[PDB]
């Protein structure tokens, strides 16, 4: 569905670095990224947001939902504010949660990459 091509990418990066990043780090609770060899890549800013959306908010076989976590709640708010039309689209097991959050941190690093 939603196409992140019209978002204010710079504002979303400022929001991530200001407040979301520290919450993913807190969630990871000392587990390091080298515990997980499989990573998820992305190719440009909207594609990164698409994958960020999917890993943050979609249930998976190994991680039922992260939607109530602080980093997720803050992600949702950032997308609601800075992606035109995003909020309209939102009106309607834990064994892989750390792996998933570690993958999210990598997707955000690529989102945040200097141009």
């Amino acid at each position: 569905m939603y196409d992140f091509t019209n978002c204010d990418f710079e504002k979303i990066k400022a929001a991530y670095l200001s407040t979301i990043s520290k919450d993913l780090i807190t969630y990871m609770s000392g587990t390091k990224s080298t515990e997980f060899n499989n990573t998820v890549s992305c190719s440009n800013r909207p594609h990164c947001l698409t994958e960020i959306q999917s890993l943050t908010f979609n249930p998976t076989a190994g991680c039922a939902s992260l939607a109530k976590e602080m980093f997720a709640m803050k992600t949702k708010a950032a997308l609601a504010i800075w992606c035109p039309g995003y909020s309209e689209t939102q009106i309607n097991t834990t064994n892989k949660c750390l792996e998933q959050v570690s993958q999210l941190q990598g997707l955000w690093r690529r989102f945040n990459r200097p141009l």
Binding site: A67, M70, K76
Partner: peptide
Amino acid sequence: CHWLENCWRGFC
């Protein structure tokens, strides 16, 4: 104003 569910209000 409609606040979304599970959505932080701190950017305001």
